Write a structure and sequence with these properties.
Chains A, B: Keywords: CBS domain. Chains A, B: This is CBS domain-containing protein. Chains A, B: It holds the Pfam family CBS. The PDB classes it as transferase. The structure is a homodimer. The first copy, chain A, has one domain: CBS-domain, CATH 3.10.580.10. By secondary structure, chain A is of the alpha+beta class. The N and C termini of chain A lie close together (8 Å). Helices cover 37% and strands 19% of the residues of chain A. In chain A, a hairpin with a 2-residue loop joins β2 and β3. Chain A has six helices and five strands; from the N terminus they run αβαββαααββα. At the A-B interface, α2, α3, α5 and α6 of A face α2, α3, α5 and α6 of B.
Chain lengths: 141, 141
């Protein structure tokens, strides 16, 4: 559909990626999300390289287990930090087809992904709302 | 965990529910989400009664099928309005246990739910961030 790429969609809204360190306490991750509540995925870096991600729904799931014992495999929090809960990063590039990015979002059940260069570094951001904007504000045919 | 109820969490952030009508075009639903980008679930009312909901991830899925033919059962959009895509509403009440509300979010894969009174009318709102705030900003033990 119109051969759009990530580069065409990732600047449609001004988003700032939320990036933490591996030893960042989960409470501070929550503080970061509450300050920028559009945030849907937290990233974890080490020496400016992308090393994990924490989707808000993953944090919600981790939280339900820790506080209520709810299982939607899950293990006990000890340090209560980013490295205990981060998942392997799912990311896009500037030249990535918009359709591959939407597929990734859906398959991984996330709504925000980082855009990375070829050395694992964050150069931009993409969310579901940008994709929606592109698709429904642009020409249907 | 601390016997919290929806009433204790649903005012921790100032949220305004996003509410559309059944004949509201999907493009206008997108415009409403872009104006208040914290929004994670759109509600559909008729005569001030709650009749459906559209989670943003449901809209993303509907969009991938319509524009790219991506199947994560799904049918062709004709009117392209709220009533063609709305799902049966999942909701809470003020006296609902916080833990039942988190379970609902997780089981239905949504992050925003309306709080309704006993006659199907919207009296407040709840999102995942409020639950996170409550759990991690309050006393752990």
């Amino acid at each position: 559909h119109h051969h759009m790429k990530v580069k065409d969609v990732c600047k449609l809204i001004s988003l700032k990626p939320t990036v933490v360190e591996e030893d960042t306490p989960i409470e501070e991750i929550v503080d970061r999300i509450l300050e920028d509540p559009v945030t849907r995925t937290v990233y974890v870096a080490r020496d400016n390289k992308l090393v994990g991600m924490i989707p808000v729904m993953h944090l919600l799931k981790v939280s339900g287990f820790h506080f209520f014992g709810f299982i939607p495999s899950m293990k006990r929090l000890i340090a209560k930090n980013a490295s205990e809960i981060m998942l392997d990063p799912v990311y896009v590039h500037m030249d990535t087809p918009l359709e591959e990015a939407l597929k990734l979002m859906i398959d991984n059940n996330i709504q925000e992904m980082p855009v990375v260069d070829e050395k694992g570094e964050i150069v931009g951001d993409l969310n579901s709302l940008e994709i929606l904007l592109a698709l429904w504000k642009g020409r249907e045919k």
